[PDB]
Write a protein that binds this ligand. Structure first.
Ligand SMILES: [Zn+2]
Ligand SMILES: [Zn+2]
Lengths: 52, 217, 102, 81, 124, 245, 62, 88, 97, 81, 124, 97, 245
């Protein structure tokens, strides 16, 4: 998700943001969470062919 | 010869975007009567070529003064804008930039008994823009020197780590004056460059060229 | 699969910008992926129009703001209309959108 | 994913800082006047004077003075009082 | 470096039907973008040492002339007053709220990118 | 013998045969700056045009612009150099700028030299590879040279004509002298009717003639009024000059 | 206290060197970087409706 | 087919080999392009305003030393010492 | 150690989770944490003032005392409000002490 | 064959030259004595003296002198002769 | 980077007899050493500019104080005498004979390398 | 041009094959080339001496003249062997000239 | 309350439980320097020995030398750490130096811990991967520790024994005190007869005992004279001390 890609950003490995989480500001919505899981299923391109 | 690589969405890139877009918003462009299309696009581009870069100048003076004012609040450092030639030398240089812009609107010729009184109140803007920055950075630091001398008179005379309710009330008064100095450091860099957009933006007006011939309906 | 290289380069390049823009994308990768967008952005900075979208927002030009954005991604359709023009030139015809009345 | 590319290049100065530092230093050393507490003398005076008498007491204040106004050197006792 | 979609198109065209579905994870990874790997430290650059020796050479030189300034104990007790606020700013500023407040100053990070809506660029 | 040694040094060391022997290293630098100082020298430019021909295929875009406007000012036309120049432009057309292409075309418009692959790659580059307000920064005497070079060669690119028509306004023509504005307005209207393309900014190149018609003939104003009626029904209205205010 | 400097022209020229370096650094280093990522986002957000409609009319895939 | 000679130097994919160098702006390349295209056409009002202040403050530095010289000569032509003899 | 990598990790766990507001209890006496910081601040100043004075105590003060004297000095060079006077008395006192 | 590898790295200083230049400069500026033709004065004299009278004539020789001994400034005419 | 002889041994083992003699020029070139290619100029390094501006800043500063030296015309005419020998050394020193004379000062270049005489390291 | 690549190639072909020992003939008058260099050397000094003197000629010489005077000067400031004397005479001459 | 606040700060912030909480970053730096200051602390070294075990396989060679001589001085023997140490040495044996291996072996010789793969990779590294005069720079009390560690474990490497026998001379034994020279000469001759290897530099470790036999017993001089007759027929001659001059 966006906040999960922000947590591994270079900004959050900085000293003042090291113990911070990007989901604490605005959390990922239920559609963003369920579409990160759906995108994890389809990173196998064989699973994407057979689904389609 | 090889430039450095920038991460997109860095915090200094986001701060300076919002800072530049703030000072650019202080002198907005004026809407023409015509709709802006490919007919009016060279008139809009030429309207931008004749406007001064006050969006760039005001964030030059914001970023060079807030960096200088906040040096005075770092330990072992004094503010450069606490000097008379530095701080008033930025105030005259804004005033001369406004005047050189307003003098070029013609052909560099300078503009009954009224106009020496419009001029005086206009020439005082020169010294008032810089002295307001200088006196604020001087009078805040000077009061802090006097009250640190008073607050040192008590532990020098009385005990070290003794009779502590007398020095606690003045170490918290000293601490709340350094905190006000962080507010005056940010405000006076804002007031200097708000006023630079006002003074330079007075002569930031030219004629919209526009369409001289049309095909109506 | 005739024009699938162009349509899937547009897809793969925007999906990589969108995944990474404002998080960790370097400016070198943007200027690699989209060199003519960076070239046209640099023209506005060079020619003192670095606030041109703020100028069009000051004067309320909402349709010249959409033309400003569309003319700066205008080169995304250039690999297509150079291909479709070299189809129609080798097939004897003329390219349609090159012509005034056509 | 690009986080380890930005950790490789470490600290770097702003991209023209050597022209700011060479511009502020060139204003502080090309003053065109003697160096703030000194006075230019003739070569006949400089070759004839000890280095303890070229020094002024005002230009060497005491590094942590026990009395305000303590100086480290004393200079020439040949005053023109 | 040619583009990776023409590398995908070529690598899928010259495979057979039998090893198509096995090859799809090595054509996927041959066209993934490079994310360079986390190298070893080699810490404190030749300019990070100039920045810290030059800042120590400045702090020692400013504290040297502060200690002979005729108000030397008032000057040295102002660095304690000024550094007390640098300590109270590390403990009071919400640094995650400040980070996301600067992200809203910039319109580039205040929203998500907006073009290319996937139904326009299909290839069926 | 001081005057004798200097005069002997001057007739064997500083001549133009050794001035073109130091000029063999970087050609388009020395070609451009000498021609701007007034050094035409038709058969010294032939030494340029063969010393640079193994290099034209790998020149930068500001080098190619420096070759063509130097070989325009020296008026020398090497047809097998100028096909290597147009094969630099039509192979690197995305890297050229409208500031650079409007000077390369005006060289190719004097020396009547064109290709169809070159005329497309200049029009593809001005329209798509360059900023859409780059015609506004051009100056209308260079845009009219580009408009006629596409009408001389019969090349109808209706996307290029909408781009070049941005750079015609009261602003861009007002920066011209009225001798040069007249030579541009007639040259731009002659190209706008050759394609039959009447954009909404044709009413600034027409109105640059009808606001001062005492510099024009009645033959040329018949040419202008032919385009005005041709543009009036295309844009769907009638022409009207504006008195300002 | 310290009111007038030893040279007023030396302090006025230090202000003009600092503020012209900040002008150079902003115009040359900061603002090209600002506008490269401001206007990638802004051109994509302004063209997005006309880009996608132009692409819808172009690809023959439907 | 549309075959990658049409996408050359127009549209590239995300890099797979290595991350390239950043493309310089023309102003980061040369100060002469900055000076002649932006610094002098657009910011000559600031450079004129910084020039006015350095000139004006050199007038005031000239008035301050011609007033020091006037008070210095009026003590050695009047038999006094021109300063307070230091203090030590 | 690696000189940039050890105590950066030591300062990190001194900055973040090392907290004397909870490890020393201290919620029993203090209302918030926003007022623990607001007197650790004033506590840092009072400690830093008392260290800077005591690290060189026998000194004639540059600052104006308000008519007060430190200890049994009261007429010495430490309390003398004329500075050229107290320079003479310090030089006499330094031979003895 | 390796000739083009050595053309890539261009000029480079000797591998510790910044410690030689910082050692020769730190001997020429940390002299511990006034700066060769000048004399340290009190602050009361420096604030009271014009910058034309702080200058000595010996310290400003003429840049290409038509007569040997020409100086550019003239200094204080208040000599103690 | 494994060693190229084990790359030769592997590439020759997994070829067939039919394409052995055709593959021998691409196994030869896969195990040739890298000789990096002549890149573009990017001339005058950030330290070659310090070396030439700092030498011009030295020559101007030394000629500045030479011109006010009380023997200024004798000082400035000694730089003409000293630079006359720098010119006569470019025209008299045999620079190829000097190069091969310094190669004989070093025993590493005064001879050829001497080990490993080819009949001892065969593999038949 | 490329600023390091043009005149490096120009200086190379000025250094190497540009030779005034053969392009100006000059083997007719000179025996070897080892003695063409041995008086181009002395020729460089005599030219450089005569340029340095003439580029500022009206000057009182720091070096000892041997009792000689340049031209019609002979009693002026240019030939005066007392330097404080000639400074006075140059300042008078500079108002007139 | 100044004394109360300092004493409260001292019992909760500066203890040895937080001294081992800053010592978790780089272990073999802090392990080595604390043990050289006299900080043994057997169950503070157990916190070291588990904090470093995910790192021993990737340590530099001067880090491995710092672990073993710290865990020798603290006398703590972690058998599953010391197999990761000998798997660092026997995987990077070409990178270790004789200065570093003679200190690692003397740790492995106190704590009687060996492998056959470790004993070969230490002997392969001292003999082939290191300079052949590196035993001469060693000091003979460390070489005798290496000689007995190969005789305790019954490992006959006749190439290693010719290398370590260089570092026995009048020079190397003369730098020893006569209490430590005696503990070395008996320890070196006991290892030289266990392999039956009598090099030509055994006549300096024998002659270090026979030039001062009043520090030895008659039991130990019977041990010495057993090796002297065993070395005399091997070298083909008879022993003779030299009076200098
Ligand atoms: Zn202070
Ligand atoms: Zn000399």
């Amino acid at each position: 998700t966006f906040a999960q890609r922000l947590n591994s950003s270079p900004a959050f490995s900085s000293f003042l943001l090291k113990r911070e989480k990007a989901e604490s500001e605005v959390p990922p919505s239920e559609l963003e969470l369920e579409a990160a899981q759906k995108a994890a299923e389809l990173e196998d391109p064989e699973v994407a062919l057979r689904t389609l | 010869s090889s430039v450095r690589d920038v991460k997109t969405g860095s915090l200094p890139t986001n701060f300076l975007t919002g800072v530049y877009r703030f000072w650019r918003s202080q002198n907005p462009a004026e809407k023409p009567h015509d709709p802006v299309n490919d007919r009016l696009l060279p008139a809009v581009v030429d309207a931008s070529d004749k406007r001064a870069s006050i969006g760039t100048w005001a964030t030059t003076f914001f970023c060079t003064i807030i960096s200088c004012n906040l040096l005075g609040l770092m330990p072992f450092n004094e503010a450069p804008t606490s000097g008379l030639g530095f701080a008033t030398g930025l105030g005259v240089s804004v005033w001369a930039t406004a005047t050189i812009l307003g003098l070029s609107k013609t052909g560099f010729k300078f503009p009954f008994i009224f106009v020496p009184l419009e001029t005086i109140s206009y020439t005082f803007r020169a010294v008032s823009l810089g002295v307001r920055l200088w006196v604020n950075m001087l009078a805040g630091h000077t009061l802090l020197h006097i009250l640190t001398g008073m607050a040192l008179a008590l532990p020098f005379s009385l005990g070290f780590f003794s009779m502590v309710p007398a020095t606690f009330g003045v170490c918290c008064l000293l601490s709340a004056l350094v905190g006000l100095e962080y507010l005056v450091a940010v405000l006076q860099s804002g007031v200097f460059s708000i006023l630079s957009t006002v003074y330079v933006g007075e002569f930031n007006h030219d004629k919209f060229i526009g369409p001289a011939a049309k095909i109506v309906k | 699969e005739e024009e699938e290289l162009w349509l899937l380069t547009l897809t793969q390049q925007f999906k990589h910008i969108q995944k990474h823009f404002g998080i960790d994308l370097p400016h070198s990768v943007v200027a690699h992926m989209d060199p003519l967008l960076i070239k046209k952005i640099d023209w506005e900075t060079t020619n003192a129009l670095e606030d041109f979208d703020i100028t069009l927002d000051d004067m309320g030009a909402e349709d010249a703001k959409e033309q400003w954005g569309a003319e700066n991604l205008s080169h995304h359709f250039l690999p297509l209309i150079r291909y479709r023009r070299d189809l129609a030139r080798k097939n004897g015809d003329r390219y349609g959108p090159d012509l005034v009345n056509g | 994913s690009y986080s380890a590319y930005f950790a490789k290049a470490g600290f770097q100065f702003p991209a023209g800082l050597s022209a700011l530092v060479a511009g502020i230093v060139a204003l502080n050393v090309c003053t065109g006047r003697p160096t703030k507490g000194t006075k230019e003398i003739s070569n006949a005076e400089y070759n004839a004077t000890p280095i303890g008498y070229l020094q002024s007491p005002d230009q060497h204040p005491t590094a942590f003075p026990k009395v305000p106004g303590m100086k480290d050197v004393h200079g020439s006792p040949h005053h023109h009082h | 470096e040619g583009n990776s979609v023409a590398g995908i198109i070529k690598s899928v065209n010259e495979t057979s039907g039998a090893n198509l579905l096995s090859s799809l994870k090595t054509i996927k990874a041959q066209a993934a973008p490079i994310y360079p790997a986390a190298a070893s430290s080699t810490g404190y650059s030749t300019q990070a040492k100039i920045a810290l020796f030059g800042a120590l050479s400045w702090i020692l030189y400013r504290a040297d002339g502060q200690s002979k300034a005729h108000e030397w104990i008032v000057d040295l007790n102002l660095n304690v007053l000024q550094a007390a606020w640098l300590i109270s700013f590390s403990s009071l500023i919400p640094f995650r709220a400040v980070y996301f407040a600067f992200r809203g100053m910039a319109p580039a990070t205040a929203s998500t990118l907006n073009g290319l809506k996937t139904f326009s660029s299909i290839s069926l | 013998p001081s005057q004798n040694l200097v005069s002997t040094f001057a007739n064997k060391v500083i001549v133009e045969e050794n001035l073109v022997n130091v000029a063999e290293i970087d050609v388009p630098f020395w070609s451009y700056w000498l021609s701007s100082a007034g050094f035409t020298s038709k058969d010294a430019f032939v030494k340029f045009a063969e010393a640079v021909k193994p290099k034209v295929a790998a020149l930068s875009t500001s080098d190619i612009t420096n070759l063509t406007v130097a070989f325009k000012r020296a008026n020398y036309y090497d047809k097998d150099l100028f096909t290597g120049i147009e094969a630099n432009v039509s192979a690197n057309f995305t890297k050229f700028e409208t500031e650079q292409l409007l000077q390369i075309v005006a060289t190719f418009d004097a020396f009547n030299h064109s290709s169809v692959a070159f005329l497309d790659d200049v029009a593809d580059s001005i329209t798509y590879c360059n900023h859409y307000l780059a015609p506004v920064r051009a100056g209308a005497d260079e845009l009219a040279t580009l408009l006629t070079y596409y009408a001389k060669n019969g090349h109808e690119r209706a996307d290029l004509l909408a781009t070049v028509a941005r750079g015609f306004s009261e602003v861009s023509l007002g920066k011209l002298s009225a001798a040069q504005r007249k030579d541009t307005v007639l040259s731009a209207l002659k190209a706008f009717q050759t394609f039959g393309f009447y954009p909404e900014s044709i009413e600034a190149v027409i109105g640059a003639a009808l606001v001062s018609p005492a510099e024009y003939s009645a033959e040329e104003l018949k040419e202008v009024e032919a385009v005005k009626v041709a543009a009036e029904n295309a844009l769907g209205g009638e022409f009207v000059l504006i008195q300002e205010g | 206290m310290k009111l007038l400097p030893e040279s007023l022209q030396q302090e006025a020229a230090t202000a003009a060197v600092v503020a012209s370096w900040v002008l150079w650094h902003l115009d040359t280093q900061l603002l090209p970087t600002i506008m490269r990522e401001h206007k990638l986002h802004a051109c994509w957000a302004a063209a997005a409706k006309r880009y996608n409609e132009k692409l819808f009319k172009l690809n023959p895939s439907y | 087919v549309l075959g990658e000679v049409y996408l050359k130097d127009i549209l590239r994919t995300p890099p797979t080999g290595a991350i390239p160098a950043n493309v310089p702006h023309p102003f980061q390349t040369s100060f002469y392009t900055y000076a002649t295209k932006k610094l002098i056409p657009r910011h000559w009002y600031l450079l004129g305003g910084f020039t006015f202040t350095i000139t004006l403050y050199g007038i005031l530095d000239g008035l301050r030393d011609s007033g020091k010289k006037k008070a210095y000569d009026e003590a050695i032509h009047a038999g006094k010492t021109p300063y307070t003899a230091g203090g030590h | 150690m690696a000189v940039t990598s050890f105590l950066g990790k030591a300062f990190e766990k001194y900055f973040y989770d090392f907290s004397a507001y909870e490890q020393f209890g201290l919620n029993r006496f203090l209302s918030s944490k926003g007022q623990y910081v607001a007197l650790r601040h004033v506590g840092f100043v009072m400690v830093g003032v008392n260290v800077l004075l005591a690290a060189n105590f026998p000194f004639n003060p540059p600052f104006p005392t308000i008519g007060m004297c430190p200890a049994g000095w009261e007429g010495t060079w430490v309390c003398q409000a004329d500075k050229a006077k107290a320079l003479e008395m310090y030089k006499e006192w330094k031979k003895s002490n």
